[PDB]
Ligand SMILES: [Mg+2]
Ligand SMILES: [Mg+2]
């Protein structure tokens with residue numbers, strides 16, 4: 679496990695916080711990082727994001743040991759099952775129909791992390807020289823950027839800029855993206871909702887994290903930066919320190 683902390687804020691421009699997440703431990707104290715952005719454009723976004731977070735917490739705490747070679751399958755299978763359960767929970771309740779959430783999550787190992795992603799929340803690794811986004815946004819504007827139809831600068835003002843193209847809960851099937859990332863030579867692992875990176879640029883995050891400070895120092899400063907940039911969304915992230923391999 680890593681030293682890690684969860685940070686969330688409703689933001690100045692939202693009535694409710696539909697983001698969710700947490701840092702959970704299984705029976706041998708392995709660590710699972712979870713972050714979910716519940717959909718505000720649809721009903722009951724906080725129900726959906728906390729449904730997925732609660733399910734991942736309960737399922738992970740019931741495990742004794744998930745070794746690195748089992749992690750991709752554990753995450754893929756549990757995300758698919760949770761999506762299935764959430765879809766039918768929504769179908770069975772008219773006030774929830776259409777609800778959904780992103781999910782980015784990470785199982786932590788000594789030398790690596792295994793990440794699953796559905797939606798436009800993000801995972802990054804950062805060191806003093808670079809910041810690498812591990813995940814790829816399942817968003818309509820990312821589709822437009824990757825197919826050459828708009829520039830990445832246009833995506834921030836596009837009328838469909840908040841639309842996402844893979845979401846938990848909205849269909850009985852989902853295909854999460856799975857990533858394995860070696861942690862060697864990185865300093866921080868960051869999971870975040872788009873309320874952060876829609877308003878704070880990658881190089882701003884890198885510059886903040888290369889400064890001295892504890893995880894709580896960095897997280898409070900990073901949260902204040904998103905708010906100073908007038909984020910119009912809920913802002914949530916987990917910041918985790920990667921321990922340099924000792925001599
Ligand atoms: Mg949301
Ligand atoms: Mg977005």
Ligand SMILES: [Mg+2]
Nearest residue numbers: 805863864865
């Ligand atoms: Mg370093």
Ligand SMILES: [Mg+2]
Nearest residue numbers: 715872873911
């Ligand atoms: Mg959001």
